[PDB]
Design a protein around this nucleic acid. Structure first.
Ligand code: ZN
Lengths: 40, 100, 49, 654, 201, 125, 128
DNA sequence: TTCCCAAAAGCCTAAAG
RNA sequence: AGACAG
């Protein structure tokens, strides 16, 4: 999901991740967005 | 163009007759014989200026700043012959000259 | 965002909408990148960048 | 009571006398014992093709030089009264020029320079062109609405353009078959410019088929086939919106596959030419070498051996021709480039190379010839992928011996299946996370009905594992065709979920999965010749088929030969030259010059060969600072010579 | 490895559909005048009492205009190229893929039409490159020597006759063009005579 | 009618040279000053010099590139054109004895630049 | 092809100041004309401007009336258009606040003419 | 911009004084 | 490095 602002040109991406509920493994999407440009 | 102007200025009889058809060939021969000795020394700005003035109907003036030394000497001989035939003998004397 | 159909007033509201309502566009999107309807023909925002 | 003429006497006639012959049926008598019944115009064309024979008055003219050589005069009139004559094509006239020049070559003791023969061939073609352009100023060809109507109004074409099931089988094998049968009939259309040109190769059949018959399944920018075909051809108007848009996308595909595929292909061609330019000299003669290469001749690769010497029985050398049925599928001892102990360091003999070396000009770089031939063929194939796209029959995916032990095919044109033997043990699928990024979406969607299976995953390798912990990895993708998990297994994964692994690979238990259901649905996508070119590049420069992995070039040539001949018809001599350019002698001792006789030596990668063979050849390739700043380049080691050396310096020989 | 040759021209390839020679090229008036600048200067100086400056002035003045003198000079240059059809030269089509992309030709005549900025390469030598008359400009390098002409003789068109990928076959690049093949078809494959049985009877 | 009508033909017997001797491109004022363009066409690229080096011996190709690169060789070619009774069919264009190989400007620049680094490419003995 | 003749409009720009001066290519000995007038026709050899570098020491060589008319292809700067092409118009820009005028007296007739017309036009615009 | 592919970094595992 | 021509 690509959203432009006056300053930034942000992008919202997603990946998968695992977590245990009631002892059983479950998979959910984690939505991330790099915002600190110096991170790259 | 510079190579062509070198090969052009290597001849004098044709250019002299292009300036003036009525020029004896004996003067041309004498000037060439004098070039055969004068080519050793250096060429000075007044000589080049006079040769550029006299010979522009057949040879471009600015080419004098690009052509080689032998071509300049032959053009000086042709200009001296033209001056000698015309009657300006004093200036003709100052064509093939050494500094001192 | 109000024109599109989102009610953002603060960037945290935007993050909540993306995490809850706009996340539908991340895995199975009703609209498509291939189309060109519902798009603007902007001139000034790029000239006066 | 036909007329009579003699081949040699008729050839000696002047052009004015030759064209001033009556319209007749005449018996042409050749220097052999066969006589040909022919009409005057075919005879005149035959003589204009025979033109190279004028300069050699002592070479007999066999009966097969004539264009209409099908008819032969015999005692029984049953064999020549009604026989179809040889079609006159540009290819046919070139073939007759070829026959004449090689008759000249073979009649002598092969002591004729082939350059002279090629000179005579172009001279004959030029005289033919001039005489045809001058004399045939009224026998022109004309096109208008009348010809298109004449082809269009044929009742069988009209039937072949109606009542058609919109499928690949029902269009591109039935209706196109009917239209081909109509066109190929030698009696239906006579005097029609379009079909007269079609019967002689002037027009390729594919365009006329797409015009008169239904246009078939255009392609999008990505090489996928639309489900719904085009009902209308080009003679009738494609007036709908869907069909116009999809053919427009075909045109867009043409533009892009031109531009960017040229961008990559020319770079690969440059690298191949740079590397092949090391193999320089082809010296005519024979090296009398005893080393032979045991090559397996197969059906597909037989045409690639068209010029090469090999040992027959009783130790005799014969060269493969275009037609050998007995040798098909058998191992023969060819005389290859490898194992040629020619004195030259970069030179090979004529016999070891092949018959093709005769066509090679005298002072030519043979490695460049091989590289240029490959570049032409691959560039043409990559650009004209659209030419082969006229048929919507997607290239089927083949299963290897290891893959067939786990996967089967049937009950569906595209999708694969799991064999019942996998029920014996609790097998388990392992896939990469890189190739499965949008998979978890199936968990969030509560109805996997409208969800496309192709967007979930794009697989190229699957590890089937069972507990002991053994199992095997299988390659499922065919170049551009990346296999995707079927809807049934997407539902199973949604029901069962998965788990990661230390190797960061998704692991799925296949226990409880309903078998005999679709598995690894294959996309309806054409294989790209661009991917095949990438495969060629990777070959030349869990088990893959890189060239360096092979021990000896003898067992390495057939793999490359088959791989190339799958899509480009490349001679075996060119493949041998390229592989021999790839070779290296004593790679341990850091010696990079070409091995002699050609087998005693390993293989090497492209970059090391380019940057460690000759610095002059390394300057024209990438990263000049790497060999400039290299200790080995300063060592006084024997090295090969490259033409750029003379260009690296100003021209000083020594 | 090569950059920006001198004595080089580049022009749209429009050809001659006339009885000609395959090793025959027709450079036009402007290309002939500028490319053969010093040849024309030499001829003017040798024949007429003209200074080299006058020679350049005449040549440049008569590039966009026609005259009989410079045409005669072109004809005499091509004639004085004695053991050749004309002035040897190399002709390039880009991209250089095959042997036939670069081929030797011999200049035979500057065209008298000033409006023809065209280059009459032979019809036969068209298929060796991918040269079609759809508005493509090809390159032309004038060989300044007989030694270079003899060297280029190895790039002459007769070198690509024999196919480099077939043992005994002429390359498909020598096949006749469309119109000529169709003319030959319409001439030879016509029912202008009765069948053989009816012809005998 | 279309554009690309011609009129862009660029025939040039001899092209003006940079101070570092090599033909250059034409600037606007100096490109609109000649009847028809006077550009030095790059008819010898990497692919063209490949084809020449392979079809013909590298000798003649190096000679052509030396005539183009070395200004003295080009001057000798023009002098041979002008100082011949037959400007066509000149026996030898550049007398290599008078003008030896190795004077081409790019190659001399490359060799000098390497020598400034302490290295020089030379033939194996 | 006569029915299909494209019309081509082109612009030729020449600068002459202290660096160089216009030659005489459209006028006789009596009248000095550097470039064609409006509605005039370019020479059979399409040549305009032909400006020559200004050198005082070469005055009796490259400033004689014959030398001004004569064009040396080398050492001179001409702009070469299509011959026979009718001139549509001319735009003149002049820096009039240089006390020593670089152009010698005599070779500034058409220049001053067109500059005066353009100055009147722009002055009337400014007055409006 | 994104895919190719080689070369250097870096890491666990293993052999000799 | 963008467009155009092949
Ligand atoms: Zn051998």
């Amino acid at each position: 999901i690509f959203i432009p602002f006056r300053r930034t040109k942000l992008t919202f991406k997603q990946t998968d991740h695992h977590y245990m509920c009631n002892g059983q493994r479950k998979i959910m999407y984690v939505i991330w967005s790099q915002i600190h440009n110096e991170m790259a | 163009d510079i190579v062509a102007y070198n090969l052009d200025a290597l001849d004098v009889v044709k250019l002299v007759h292009k300036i003036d058809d009525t020029v004896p060939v004996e003067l041309i021969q004498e000037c060439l014989d004098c070039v055969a000795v004068t080519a050793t020394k250096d060429i000075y700005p007044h000589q080049i200026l006079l040769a550029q003035w006299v010979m522009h109907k057949a040879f471009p003036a600015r080419a004098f700043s690009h052509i080689n030394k032998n071509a300049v000497n032959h053009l000086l001989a042709a200009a001296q012959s033209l001056m000698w035939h015309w009657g300006f003998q004093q200036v003709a004397v100052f064509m093939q000259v050494e500094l001192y | 965002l109000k024109t599109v159909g989102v009610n953002v007033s603060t960037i945290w509201e935007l993050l909540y909408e993306i995490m809850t309502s706009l996340a539908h566009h991340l895995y199975a999107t009703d609209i498509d990148e291939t189309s060109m309807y519902g798009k603007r023909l902007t001139v000034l925002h790029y000239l006066m960048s | 009571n036909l007329n009579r003429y003699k081949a040699r006497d008729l050839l000696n006639l002047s052009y004015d006398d030759l064209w001033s012959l009556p319209s007749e049926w005449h018996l042409i008598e050749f220097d052999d014992g066969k006589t040909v019944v022919s009409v005057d115009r075919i005879t005149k064309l035959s003589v204009l093709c025979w033109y190279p024979l004028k300069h050699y008055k002592d070479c007999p003219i066999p009966s097969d030089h004539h264009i209409d050589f099908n008819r032969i005069l015999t005692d029984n009139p049953k064999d020549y009264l009604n026989v179809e004559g040889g079609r006159v094509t540009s290819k046919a006239m070139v073939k007759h020029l070829n026959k004449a020049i090689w008759n000249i070559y073979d009649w002598s003791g092969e002591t004729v320079d082939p350059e002279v023969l090629s000179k005579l061939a172009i001279e004959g073609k030029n005289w033919l062109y001039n005489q045809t352009t001058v004399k045939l100023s009224e026998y022109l060809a004309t096109l208008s609405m009348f010809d298109i109507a004449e082809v269009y109004n044929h009742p069988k074409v009209r039937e072949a353009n109606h009542n058609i099931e919109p499928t690949t089988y029902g269009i591109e094998k039935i209706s196109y078959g009917k239209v081909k049968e109509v066109f190929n009939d030698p009696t239906q259309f006579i005097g029609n410019s379009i079909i007269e040109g079609l019967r002689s190769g002037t027009q390729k059949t594919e365009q006329l088929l797409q015009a008169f018959a239904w246009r078939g399944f255009p392609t999008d920018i990505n090489s996928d086939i639309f489900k719904y075909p085009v009902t209308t051809g080009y003679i009738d108007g494609i007036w709908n919106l869907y069909e116009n848009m999809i053919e427009s996308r075909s045109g867009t595909k043409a533009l892009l596959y031109n531009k960017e595929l040229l961008r990559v292909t020319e770079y690969f061609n440059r690298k191949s030419q740079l590397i092949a330019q090391y193999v320089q000299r082809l010296h005519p003669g024979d090296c009398k070498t005893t080393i032979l290469a045991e090559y397996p001749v197969t059906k597909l690769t037989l045409k690639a051996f068209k010029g090469k010497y090999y040992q027959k029985e009783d130790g005799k050398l014969d060269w493969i021709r275009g037609n050998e049925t007995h040798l098909i599928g058998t191992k023969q001892k060819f005389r290859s480039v490898f194992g040629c102990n020619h004195p030259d360091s970069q030179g090979i003999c004529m016999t070891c190379y092949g018959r093709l070396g005769i066509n090679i000009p005298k002072g030519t770089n043979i490695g460049q010839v091989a590289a240029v031939s490959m570049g032409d063929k691959i560039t043409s194939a990559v650009l004209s992928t659209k030419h082969t796209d006229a048929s919507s029959a997607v290239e089927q995916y083949k299963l290897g011996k290891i893959e067939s032990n786990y996967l089967r095919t049937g009950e569906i044109p595209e999708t694969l299946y799991l064999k019942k033997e996998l029920t014996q043990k609790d097998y388990r699928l392992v896939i990469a996370r890189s190739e499965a990024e949008n998979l978890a979406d199936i968990l969030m969607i509560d109805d996997l009905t409208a969800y496309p299976a192709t967007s979930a995953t794009e697989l190229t390798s699957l590890a089937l594992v069972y507990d002991d912990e053994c199992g095997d990895v299988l390659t499922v993708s065919l170049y551009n065709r990346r296999a995707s998990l079927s809807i049934e297994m997407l539902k199973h994964i949604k029901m069962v979920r998965w788990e990661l692994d230390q190797r960061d690979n998704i692991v799925i238990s296949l226990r409880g999965f309903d078998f005999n259901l679709p598995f690894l649905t294959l996309p309806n996508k054409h294989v790209n010749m661009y991917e095949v070119m990438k495969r060629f590049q990777s070959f030349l420069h869990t088990s893959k088929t890189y060239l360096k992995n092979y021990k000896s070039p003898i067992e390495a040539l057939p793999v490359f030969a088959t791989m190339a001949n799958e899509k480009i018809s490349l001679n075996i001599s060119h493949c041998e030259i390229l592989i021999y350019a790839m070779m290296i002698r004593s790679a341990q001792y850091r010696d990079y010059r070409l091995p002699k006789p050609g087998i005693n030596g390993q293989f090497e990668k492209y970059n090391r060969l380019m940057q460690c063979r000759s610095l002059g050849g390394a300057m024209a390739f990438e990263k000049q600072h790497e060999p400039l700043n290299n200790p080995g380049s300063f060592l006084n080691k024997m090295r090969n010579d490259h033409p750029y050396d003379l260009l690296v310096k100003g021209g000083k020989l020594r | 490895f090569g950059a920006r040759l001198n004595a080089t021209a580049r022009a749209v390839i429009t050809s001659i559909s006339d009885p000609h020679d395959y090793d025959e090229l027709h450079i036009p008036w402007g290309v002939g005048c500028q490319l053969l600048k010093y040849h024309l200067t030499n001829k003017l100086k040798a024949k007429f009492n003209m200074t080299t400056r006058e020679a350049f002035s005449f040549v440049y003045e008569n590039v966009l205009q026609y005259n009989q003198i410079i045409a005669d000079l072109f004809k005499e240059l091509i004639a004085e190229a004695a053991p050749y059809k004309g002035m040897g030269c190399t002709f390039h089509r880009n991209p250089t893929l095959q042997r036939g992309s670069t081929q030797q030709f011999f200049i035979t005549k500057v065209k008298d039409d000033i409006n023809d900025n065209s280059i009459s390469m032979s019809v036969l030598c068209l298929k060796a490159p991918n040269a079609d008359f759809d508005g493509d400009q090809l390159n032309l390098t004038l060989m300044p020597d007989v030694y270079l002409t003899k060297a280029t003789e190895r790039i002459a068109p007769h070198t690509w006759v024999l196919s480099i990928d077939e043992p005994h076959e002429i390359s498909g690049n020598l096949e006749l063009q469309g119109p000529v093949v169709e003319t030959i078809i319409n001439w030879a494959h016509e029912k202008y005579l009765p069948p053989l049985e009816e012809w005998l009877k | 009618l279309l554009e690309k009508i011609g009129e862009d033909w660029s025939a040039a017997a001899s092209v003006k040279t940079q101070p570092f001797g090599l033909p250059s491109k034409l600037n606007n004022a100096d490109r609109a000053s000649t009847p028809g363009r006077e550009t030095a066409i790059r008819s010898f690229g990497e692919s063209e010099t490949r084809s020449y080096n392979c079809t013909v011996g590298p000798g003649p190709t190096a000679e052509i590139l030396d005539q183009t690169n070395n200004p003295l060789a080009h001057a000798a070619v023009i002098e041979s054109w002008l100082t011949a009774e037959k400007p066509s069919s000149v026996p030898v264009a550049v007398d290599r004895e008078k003008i030896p190989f190795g004077g081409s400007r790019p190659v001399a620049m490359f060799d000098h630049l390497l020598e400034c680094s302490g290295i020089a490419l030379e033939y194996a003995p | 092809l006569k029915r299909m003749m494209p019309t081509s409009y082109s612009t030729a720009v020449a600068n002459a100041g202290r660096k160089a001066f216009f030659l005489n290519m459209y006028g006789d000995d009596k009248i000095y004309k550097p470039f064609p007038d409006i509605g005039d026709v370019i020479r059979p050899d399409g040549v305009i401007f032909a400006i020559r570098d200004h050198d005082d020491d070469l005055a009796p060589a490259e400033m004689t009336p014959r030398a001004l008319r004569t064009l040396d292809r080398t050492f001179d700067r001409a702009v070469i258009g299509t011959p026979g092409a009718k001139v549509i118009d001319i735009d003149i820009w002049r820096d009039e606040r240089v006390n020593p005028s670089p152009t010698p007296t005599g070779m500034d007739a058409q220049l001053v003419k067109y500059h005066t017309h353009l100055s009147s036009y722009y002055r009337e615009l400014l007055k409006i």
